Amino acid sequence: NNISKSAIIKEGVIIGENVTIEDNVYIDYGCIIRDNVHIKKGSFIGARSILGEYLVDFYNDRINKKHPLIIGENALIRTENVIYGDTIIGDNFQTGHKVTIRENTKIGNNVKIGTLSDIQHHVYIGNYVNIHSNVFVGEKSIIKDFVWLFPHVVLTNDPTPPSNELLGVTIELFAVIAARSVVLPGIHINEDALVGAGAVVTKDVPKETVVVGNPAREICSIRKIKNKITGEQVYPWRYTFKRGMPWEETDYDTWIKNI
Amino acid sequence: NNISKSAIIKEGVIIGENVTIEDNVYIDYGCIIRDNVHIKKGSFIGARSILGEYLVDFYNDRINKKHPLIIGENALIRTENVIYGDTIIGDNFQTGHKVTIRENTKIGNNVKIGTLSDIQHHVYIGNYVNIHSNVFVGEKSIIKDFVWLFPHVVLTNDPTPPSNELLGVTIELFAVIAARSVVLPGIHINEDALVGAGAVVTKDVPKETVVVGNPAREICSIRKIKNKITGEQVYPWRYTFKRGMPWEETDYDTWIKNI
Amino acid sequence: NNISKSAIIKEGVIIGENVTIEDNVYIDYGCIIRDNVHIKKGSFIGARSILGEYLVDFYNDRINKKHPLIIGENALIRTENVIYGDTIIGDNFQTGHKVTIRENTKIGNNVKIGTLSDIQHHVYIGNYVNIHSNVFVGEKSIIKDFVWLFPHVVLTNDPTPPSNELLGVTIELFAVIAARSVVLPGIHINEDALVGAGAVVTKDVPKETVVVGNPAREICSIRKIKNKITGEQVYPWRYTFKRGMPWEETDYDTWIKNI
Ligand SMILES: CC(C)(COP(=O)(O)OP(=O)(O)OC[C@H]1O[C@@H](n2cnc3c(N)ncnc32)[C@H](O)[C@@H]1OP(=O)(O)O)[C@@H](O)C(=O)NCCC(=O)NCCS
Ligand SMILES: CC(C)(COP(=O)(O)OP(=O)(O)OC[C@H]1O[C@@H](n2cnc3c(N)ncnc32)[C@H](O)[C@@H]1OP(=O)(O)O)[C@@H](O)C(=O)NCCC(=O)NCCS
Ligand SMILES: CC(C)(COP(=O)(O)OP(=O)(O)OC[C@H]1O[C@@H](n2cnc3c(N)ncnc32)[C@H](O)[C@@H]1OP(=O)(O)O)[C@@H](O)C(=O)NCCC(=O)NCCS
Ligand SMILES: Cc1cn([C@H]2C[C@H](O)[C@@H](COP(=O)(O)OP(=O)(O)O[C@H]3O[C@H](C)[C@H](O)[C@H](N)[C@H]3O)O2)c(=O)[nH]c1=O
Ligand SMILES: Cc1cn([C@H]2C[C@H](O)[C@@H](COP(=O)(O)OP(=O)(O)O[C@H]3O[C@H](C)[C@H](O)[C@H](N)[C@H]3O)O2)c(=O)[nH]c1=O
Ligand SMILES: Cc1cn([C@H]2C[C@H](O)[C@@H](COP(=O)(O)OP(=O)(O)O[C@H]3O[C@H](C)[C@H](O)[C@H](N)[C@H]3O)O2)c(=O)[nH]c1=O
Numbered sequence: 084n085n086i087s088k089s090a091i092i093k094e095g096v097i098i099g100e101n102v103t104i105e106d107n108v109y110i111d112y113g114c115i116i117r118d119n120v121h122i123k124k125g126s127f128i129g130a131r132s133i134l135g136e137y138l139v140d141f142y143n144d145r146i147n148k149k150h151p152l153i154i155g156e157n158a159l160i161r162t163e164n165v166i167y168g169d170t171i172i173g174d175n176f177q178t179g180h181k182v183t184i185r186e187n188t189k190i191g192n193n194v195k196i197g198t199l200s201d202i203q204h205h206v207y208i209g210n211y212v213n214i215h216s217n218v219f220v221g222e223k224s225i226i227k228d229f230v231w232l233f234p235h236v237v238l239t240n241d242p243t244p245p246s247n248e249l250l251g252v253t254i255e256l257f258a259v260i261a262a263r264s265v266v267l268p269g270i271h272i273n274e275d276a277l278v279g280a281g282a283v284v285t286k287d288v289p290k291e292t293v294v295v296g297n298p299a300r301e302i303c304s305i306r307k308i309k310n311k312i313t314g315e316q317v318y319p320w321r322y323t324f325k326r327g328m329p330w331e332e333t334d335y336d337t338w339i340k341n342i
Numbered sequence: 343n344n345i346s347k348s349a350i351i352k353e354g355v356i357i358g359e360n361v362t363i364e365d366n367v368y369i370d371y372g373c374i375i376r377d378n379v380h381i382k383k384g385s386f387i388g389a390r391s392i393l394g395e396y397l398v399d400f401y402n403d404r405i406n407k408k409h410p411l412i413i414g415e416n417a418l419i420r421t422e423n424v425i426y427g428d429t430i431i432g433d434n435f436q437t438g439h440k441v442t443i444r445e446n447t448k449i450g451n452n453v454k455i456g457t458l459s460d461i462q463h464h465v466y467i468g469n470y471v472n473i474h475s476n477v478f479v480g481e482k483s484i485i486k487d488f489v490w491l492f493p494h495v496v497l498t499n500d501p502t503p504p505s506n507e508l509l510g511v512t513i514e515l516f517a518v519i520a521a522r523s524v525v526l527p528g529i530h531i532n533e534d535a536l537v538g539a540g541a542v543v544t545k546d547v548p549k550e551t552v553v554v555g556n557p558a559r560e561i562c563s564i565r566k567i568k569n570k571i572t573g574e575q576v577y578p579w580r581y582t583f584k585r586g587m588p589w590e591e592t593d594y595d596t597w598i599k600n601i
Numbered sequence: 602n603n604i605s606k607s608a609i610i611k612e613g614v615i616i617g618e619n620v621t622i623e624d625n626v627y628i629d630y631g632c633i634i635r636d637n638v639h640i641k642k643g644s645f646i647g648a649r650s651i652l653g654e655y656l657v658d659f660y661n662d663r664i665n666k667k668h669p670l671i672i673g674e675n676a677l678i679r680t681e682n683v684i685y686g687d688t689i690i691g692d693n694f695q696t697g698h699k700v701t702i703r704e705n706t707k708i709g710n711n712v713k714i715g716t717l718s719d720i721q722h723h724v725y726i727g728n729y730v731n732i733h734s735n736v737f738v739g740e741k742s743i744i745k746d747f748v749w750l751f752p753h754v755v756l757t758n759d760p761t762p763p764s765n766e767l768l769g770v771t772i773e774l775f776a777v778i779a780a781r782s783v784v785l786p787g788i789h790i791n792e793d794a795l796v797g798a799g800a801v802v803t804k805d806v807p808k809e810t811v812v813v814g815n816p817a818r819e820i821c822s823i824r825k826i827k828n829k830i831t832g833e834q835v836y837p838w839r840y841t842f843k844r845g846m847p848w849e850e851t852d853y854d855t856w857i858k859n860i
Contacts, residue, residue, distance in 0.1 A: 248830040263524040265781040265799045281524045281542035283799035297556045297815045312507040522783040540801035556815045571766040
């Protein structure tokens with residue numbers, strides 16, 4: 084192991100082998116840090132979380148194989164998060180409570196995953212992605228930058244279950260999936276699209292389009308939407324909302340010029 | 343601190359500062375009692391729960407600020423509940439497992455919150471409220487006395503997400519929201535209304551009215567409903583159901599005369 | 602107690618009385634094994650799980666009554682599962698994380714229950730049943746062999762809530778309930794039926810029938826369904842899918858001849 088003198092490791096913490104904990108990481112009461120886990124500088128790991136959780140192969144003979152987990156700098160991981168090995172999480176990651184993240188998954192920077200969320204294996208999550216409470220993200224899902232998944236959203240992948248050939252969902256830049264929506268396997272949700280709350284999305288959703296219902300149906304251009312309090316046009320949301328975004332201190336247009 | 347000699351504190355328990363535990367409180371294995379938490383007499387706190395959980399400001403510099411949490415008398419809090427500071431919970435509170443309750447929230451007396459439920463910040467819950475399994479209660483929601491939220495209900499608050507101006511839902515006295523229903527932001531569910539299972543509630547629901555569907559539509563007066571086993575009129579439910587209610591030992595009419 | 606010399610009991614484990622742990626059982630960090638729990642040979646019990654969790658009667662006077670829990674051979678129980686007393690689980694059981702299983706419940710062999718699932722009391726689950734992530738199974742539900750419940754499915758039981766007379770759902774052999782579906786009380790889902798994702802099932806679903814929508818409506822024979830990748834007829838699924846099934850090494854027809 085390699086643990087920094089500035090790291091704060093509370094009691095009850097259990098540490099395995101081939102563990103690297105950088106500078107100013109704080110590991111709260113009772114976490115279990117299994118083998119092959121690397122936590123980058125400045126991170127906070129919440130009470131009782133279990134990092135580098137066992138992949139299936141461990142159970143064959145109870146011998147833990149090597150499946151490195153890396154968590155980027157300055158994470159703010161809340162209590163009891165369970166994160167599998169063979170996964171990579173970028174910088175400035177934040178979570179709510181009791182989140183579960185599987186193996187062979189990649190999560191970008193400045194991503195937020197809320198309480199109870201369940202990220203399966205072989206998932207791709209980009210940067211500045213916001214996944215709220217109890218969202219189910221099935222294997223093979225691809226979530227592009229700036230997408231928002233509201234509470235209780237479920238992204239599926241078996242088109243005619245149970246079957247052998249899975250098709251993951253792809254959610255393109257800035258699309259928002261409102262709460263309690265379920266997306267069917269292999270569907271493409273296009274850029275700046277809006278899936279209304281509770282929808283059952285059975286077909287691809289075209290860019291800048293709003294769909295609602297079971298089955299979801301297109302009701303209009305996202306541009307038609309007016310803020311309910313101020314009467315202003317809302318979407319694309321990048322010009323009306325910037326809390327926690329990279330253009331927070333400027334404006335989208337200037338920011339995107341620079342990138 | 344101030345801990346009663348009659349309190350039973352199991353092992354693994356971790357206690358912070360400015361903690362007050364009254365008489366005959368029982369704190370099960372491994373709970374973490376962070377600073378500024380007051381647990382009233384007779385309460386049971388389940389294994390591994392974490393009380394007075396850190397608000398966001400702690401993370402600025404890892405210095406825990408003062409945000410008192412008070413839990414009323416005779417709570418029956420199950421395992422692994424996470425409850426934030428700056429919140430008040432009344433007497434005879436009961437929970438299921440792994441419930442999460444945020445800050446700046448107020449919960450009345452004789453309230454029940456089930457397994458996995460997630461109560462966000464700035465929520466108001468009255469008395470004799472029953473929230474069943476895995477209900478998501480968003481910030482600014484106002485839940486009046488005697489309301490029932492069935493498993494997987496989700497109360498939302500961002501009308502055109504992501505946006506800055508939130509509108510909480512208000513659920514009036516005795517209304518029942520059946521399972522897997524989602525309520526849109528700022529909706530008013532009126533007294534004795536019934537939201538049928540799985541509904542997507544997009545408009546206010548008038549008193550004593552039953553709505554179903556996606557989007558929910560009024561189908562009839564709640565009074566039209568017959569018990570499926572006995573054929574008797576069901577609603578208002580206060581005259582047909584009294585298990586755990588304050589008129590349990592009498593009758594509604596006599597009881598309400600007295601209050 | 603009766604604990605095998607071959608059992609591996611990690612630290613932090615807490616064991617009560619009248620506990621029997623067979624040969625080659627492995628109990629991971631911090632589990633709490635309350636009284637009257639019998640874990641059969643070869644089982645793995647994940648970190649921080651709590652087995653033989655207290656029934657309601659304990660709380661009367663904080664005296665734990667006798668409600669035996671038995672877990673069959675070779676379980677693979679993941680972290681933080683909470684399992685009540687007065688319940689029986691068969692052999693080769695596997696779970697995801699943070700699953701909750703209530704009392705007076707019976708679970709067969711080769712059953713899988715995923716992350717966050719919540720099994721209430723007085724539930725019946727047969728063999729080779731697959732319950733995926735965050736499924737809510739209400740009391741009195743009867744789930745027959747080979748049934749699949751996809752993420753976020755919810756089986757209800759109070760027909761006109763809150764009421765006193767509950768009616769459990771019955772899911773017959775091999776039926777599949779797709780994700781985010783809710784089934785109303787007392788409904789019968791017949792053999793080899795398919796409930797499409799997100800459905801609101803308000804009426805019995807006839808054998809080999811596919812229903813979709815809110816409220817769910819019959820759209821066709823399950824036999825009409827073609828695999829989306831291969832174009833082949835999918836159902837009954839027993840002839841097209843066999844991963845983890847008892848006819849995995851043979852074929853259904855030969856297998857069922859033998860049983
Ligand atoms: C997409 C959305 C913004 C559109 O709502 P809207 O602007 O209020 O649409 P309208 O109020 O103009 O209603 C338009 C019509 O579509 C219906 N409708 C609106 N949203 C619907 C939905 N999610 N599902 C089904 N029907 C819907 C309305 O009932 C109305 O139908 P009607 O007048 O014929 O009876 C809204 O459905 C939504 O999803 N809000 C997000 C809630 C959320 O999840 N926030 C994040 C979590 S806090
Ligand atoms: C509101 C409720 C009681 C009405 O159910 P109901 O009395 O069976 O209504 P009916 O059986 O008379 O059916 C009336 C019509 O409305 C439809 N309907 C009933 N409930 C519906 C629902 N929740 N969503 C959509 N449609 C619904 C029925 O299919 C029928 O339609 P149809 O005959 O044209 O095909 C029921 O929907 C419900 O919510 N039960 C609560 C289940 C629950 O969540 N319990 C608590 C958790 S245990
Ligand atoms: C039942 C199911 C297989 C049928 O999907 P399907 O074969 O794609 O049906 P189709 O694509 O031929 O679409 C048929 C029609 O029914 C509609 N439809 C399909 N599934 C629907 C659903 N779940 N709810 C409502 N409508 C649905 C389609 O939109 C189309 O309507 P339209 O053409 O008039 O606009 C699918 O709904 C489903 O449930 N897949 C399972 C997803 C899942 O939960 N997997 C397990 C978790 S990974
Ligand atoms: C900040 C914080 C978050 N969380 C969890 C709760 C949620 O599951 C997840 C995100 O919570 P958050 O307060 O950061 O919420 P936000 O992601 O900021 O979402 C808000 O803004 C959105 C645009 C929408 O308007 C939404 N309705 C609002 O809640 O993280 C905690 O558990 N504790 C915390 O202290
Ligand atoms: C009593 C008890 C409750 N709980 C959790 C389970 C649920 O999430 C929540 C409420 O469970 P509960 O048994 O007290 O159920 P109730 O609130 O009594 O709801 C029942 O009555 C309602 C009218 C409806 O008919 C409903 N379908 C029934 O389950 O608390 C436990 O985890 N363990 C327990 O021992
Ligand atoms: C194997 C495994 C499962 N689990 C949990 C995750 C789920 O909640 C539950 C089942 O996960 P699983 O990988 O065994 O999935 P399966 O039950 O194999 O389901 C797959 O195959 C089905 C036919 C459908 O195509 C489905 N979309 C696929 O995911 O157990 C873990 O937490 N860790 C694990 O390592």
